[PDB]
Amino acid sequence: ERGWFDILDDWLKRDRFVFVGWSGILLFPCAYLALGGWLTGTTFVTSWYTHGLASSYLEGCNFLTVAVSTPANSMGHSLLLLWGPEAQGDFTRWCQLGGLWTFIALHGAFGLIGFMLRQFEIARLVGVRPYNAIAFSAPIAVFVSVFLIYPLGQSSWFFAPSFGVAAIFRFLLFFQGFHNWTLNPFHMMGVAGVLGGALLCAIHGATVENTLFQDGEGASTFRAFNPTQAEETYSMVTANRFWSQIFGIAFSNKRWLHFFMLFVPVTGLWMSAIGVVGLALNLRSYDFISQEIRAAEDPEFETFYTKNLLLNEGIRAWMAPQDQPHENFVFPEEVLPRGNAL
Amino acid sequence: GTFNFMIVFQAEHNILMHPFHQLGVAGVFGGALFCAMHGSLVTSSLIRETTETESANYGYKFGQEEETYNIVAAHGYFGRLIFQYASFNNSRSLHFFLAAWPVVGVWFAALGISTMAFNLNGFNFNHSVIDAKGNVINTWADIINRANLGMEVMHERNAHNFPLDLA
Amino acid sequence: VSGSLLYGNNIITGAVVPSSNAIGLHFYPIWEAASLDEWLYNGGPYQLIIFHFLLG
Amino acid sequence: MEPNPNRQPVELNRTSLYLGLLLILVLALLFSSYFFN
């Protein structure tokens, strides 16, 4: 066997500055276009016709406020292909209709597939276990649930997140006011995995750096390590005693420690994704029914739970007319929910 | 009550638009990313010491002198994933980065709250973009503003007697 | 505002509620109240807890 | 009957017991409010 396939395989897998691989054929164009599309849109492209917003440096936005915004609600879940029945091959009209949104989301999705394939491909060539690729399933579950499944359960791509700093912040506040997403135990598990992961990152980094063996004469201790050295660079035994005495428990097994560091943030992200799949259908943890029954009958009963719903009702009434322009909402001053004075 | 604090904080300080909270988010998202990354890379390069009918965790014994994974293989992997010089070959440097990234970000998060405590608030681009006539052209900042207004007008609905919420 | 389990809260809605705006930044230890009933009405537990916690 | 050679003993160490009970109890503490609604 020495055909063109194997010759191509040879070239693809050459040890170069930027590894390519078979996965590179999917990854590099899709990632490049996703990123290029974002930079192109945020630099030059409006959201006037889809959202009634300026969204580019060209129009006067800054890095925080630029976005590539979702298509108009009237587009539904149109693939919005350049050559599709909406844009009909017109690049300018395609930009004005939000074609760059599906462009970025879809090349982004195929690019993420390419990146994970790259993780598998390289692991296989180098001869390591593919836990990095496995861990990357969490970013993929988040991207897919939030940017694809969520809008697919809603009326249109309009309600997906727009690709932008301020736009994403709007997406957070929308989820609070409309979905009460903070109340959702799947989001809560996500939070614990993210914050728990950040905790593990900090505490493990600090513990290693503070249980180092003296392996050099330097007061700056980084040079006193050699990649090829056989020995542990820090004392697991001393680390274990420290935490056992400070916190009550401590790791004693390095393999477990490092697996747990994979498990925690990965599991968190996967949990948050499940909650978002529910939100695609408005299947929220919005309310506690027992709370509502009590509060309806008893005007003196108040909790932080009832207080947050009042905030949500304000968010919805105050943001909906500008945030959902296709609804043509007109809410007279007199109907707007407000407390005293404000 | 925590969520209540967060929502009211957003109304009154536009924390999301504050760079110290943004550094905080980079700190915790990044902390989680690097946690998963480090976990996965060390786990990926564990030296075979066990059979398939047992946990690989038994391949490490508490207090052993020899490292339990191959950092050269780990770096060999990650350096090819991105490119050679974006990967750490020094465990001390790597672990310092793991400590520093989340800690510094969270210091900025803390300082965000501690400085918005004195009402130096998030970026305010409300009506920043204006057309040739003077019409306001909304940006996503203005949509944020509408959400914030909802929070503001509704919070502590019986507590304010005067038009401005000054503390 | 009800924060406790026995007064109609679950784990998610429940809290120890911050001390009264009437108190402000005034130090409100148990002995500054005329009774435990007053102390509780005004959110004395919050101050006791957060001050001991922050020190600890 | 002639014994099955594919049989393997199963293990759960104490730490795993503790970790597992913590997971379960904390999940229960989290989800219980929603089950009661």
Binding site: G248 | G63 | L5 | -
Partner: peptide
């Protein structure tokens, strides 16, 4: 009954902390 349930789970977790600390399998250098 709900309150009992919440407090019961919490109390089990606290007991678990006690056993996990004072009755852990001791770490041993081999």
């Amino acid at each position: 009954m709900e309150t009992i349930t919440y407090v019961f789970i919490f109390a089990c977790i606290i007991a678990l902390f006690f056993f996990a600390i004072f009755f852990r399998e001791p770490p041993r250098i081999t």
